[PDB]
């Protein structure tokens, strides 16, 4: 099928269910594209898949999409070169893709189960922007008879924090909203910091919504732990050194341009909660190599 069908299917899948990330939609679109092929040679199919991934990347500019596409491409073909009939190989790869899609969807519950035991009783928690996995973690924590208070940030320019505040108020939890310029003023009362992630880099740092770097520095100045929640399919191969090493195709969405993302160094992070387990920033270098088979 052509690119117009690809874009239409992608947008329809995104719009049908709001509780879904871009990566899952991209993976489902790629699987549907795989099921609608007619070729006879493997590398022609490889070229078609690469072109499809490249076209899909141009619509939405997020880090997770490209990494998910690459992981899907190199995970689908562990053993598909044995027989001489195209049909058997195609069936085997379709089965492998279905298995991969099945295995993708169990990460959030594992993350919540591993992370909910780090919250004390009667504690104040700071957070930035909106993230669904953090909400799941908090739901699991409140299901275990614990009490805490939450501070959130308005997170300009789209006021994303108020949405998370409204979602939190539905679970009768004390939640308050502060300004974007009062983070350092309010760090005094906090006890721990939990944020989401948009991509994990080779040296252990992260890429996230603009405004995380200053919060991390302020928390480091007063010796507060910094926790990160992420997923396996968000691992990318990149080794930035400063703020200007980030590729420009991720900074500006499709100074005065207001870049949307920023990078945080591994020396300001305490622990990482992934579906692979609990890893210090030093083990990410090995785990990324092992993952990229």
């Amino acid at each position: 099928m052509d690119d117009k069908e690809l874009i239409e299917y992608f947008k329809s899948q995104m719009k049908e269910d709001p509780d879904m990330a871009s990566a899952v939609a991209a993976i489902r679109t790629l699987l549907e594209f795989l099921k609608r092929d007619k070729g006879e040679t493997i590398q022609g199919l490889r070229a078609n898949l690469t072109s499809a991934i490249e076209t899909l990347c141009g619509v939405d500019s997020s880090v997770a999409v490209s990494s998910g596409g690459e992981l899907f491409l190199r995970f689908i073909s562990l053993a598909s070169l044995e027989y001489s009939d195209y049909s058997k190989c195609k069936k085997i790869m379709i089965e492998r893709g279905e298995l991969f899609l099945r295995r993708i969807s169990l990460s959030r519950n594992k993350i919540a189960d591993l992370c909910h035991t780090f919250i004390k009783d009667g504690a104040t928690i700071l957070t930035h922007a909106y993230s669904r996995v953090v909400l799941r973690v908090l739901e699991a924590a409140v299901a275990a008879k614990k009490r805490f208070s939450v501070y959130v940030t308005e997170s300009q320019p789209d006021l994303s924090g108020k949405k998370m505040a409204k979602a939190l108020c539905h679970l009768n939890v004390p939640v308050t909203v502060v300004l974007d310029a009062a983070v350092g003023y309010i760090m005094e009362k906090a006890d721990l910091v939990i944020v989401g992630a948009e991509g994990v880099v080779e040296n252990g740092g992260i890429i996230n919504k603009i405004g995380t770097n200053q919060m991390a520095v302020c928390a480091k100045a007063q010796n507060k732990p910094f926790y990160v929640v992420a997923e396996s399919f968000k691992f990318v191969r990149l080794f930035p050194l400063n703020q200007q090493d980030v590729p420009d195709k991720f900074k500006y969405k499709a100074k005065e341009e207001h870049p949307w993302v920023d990078y945080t160094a591994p020396s300001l992070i305490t622990l990482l909660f992934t579906d692979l387990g609990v890893l210090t920033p030093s083990a990410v270098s090995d785990e990324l190599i092992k993952l990229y088979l």
Binding site: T117, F118, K120, L271, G277, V278, L279, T280, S282, A283, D286
Partner: protein, 87 residues
């Protein structure tokens, strides 16, 4: 700073439980019982163990050689199966 310790003192746990992390004993060691009524409104605490973060350690001397603190994780991966982490 140098730590001397064999291999059977390595455990697959993270510092998240606290509470029972320390070990408290009778306050008799600190304040004698012969202090009279003063021992009716005073709280005495006698911990035993203490927690040390890993940024303050330089080397580990074991029965195989010297290793940096960041290597310990790898050792664990070859000692215990991840299934049996929680009994």
């Amino acid at each position: 700073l140098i730590v001397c310790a064999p291999m059977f003192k390595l455990s697959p746990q993270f510092p998240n439980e606290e509470d029972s992390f320390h070990k408290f004993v009778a306050p008799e060691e600190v304040l004698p019982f012969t202090e009279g009524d003063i021992l009716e409104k005073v709280s005495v605490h006698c911990p035993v163990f203490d927690y040390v973060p890993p940024e303050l350690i330089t080397l580990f001397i074991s029965n195989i050689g010297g290793n940096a603190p960041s290597y310990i994780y790898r050792l664990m991966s070859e000692l215990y199966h991840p299934d049996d982490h929680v009994l």
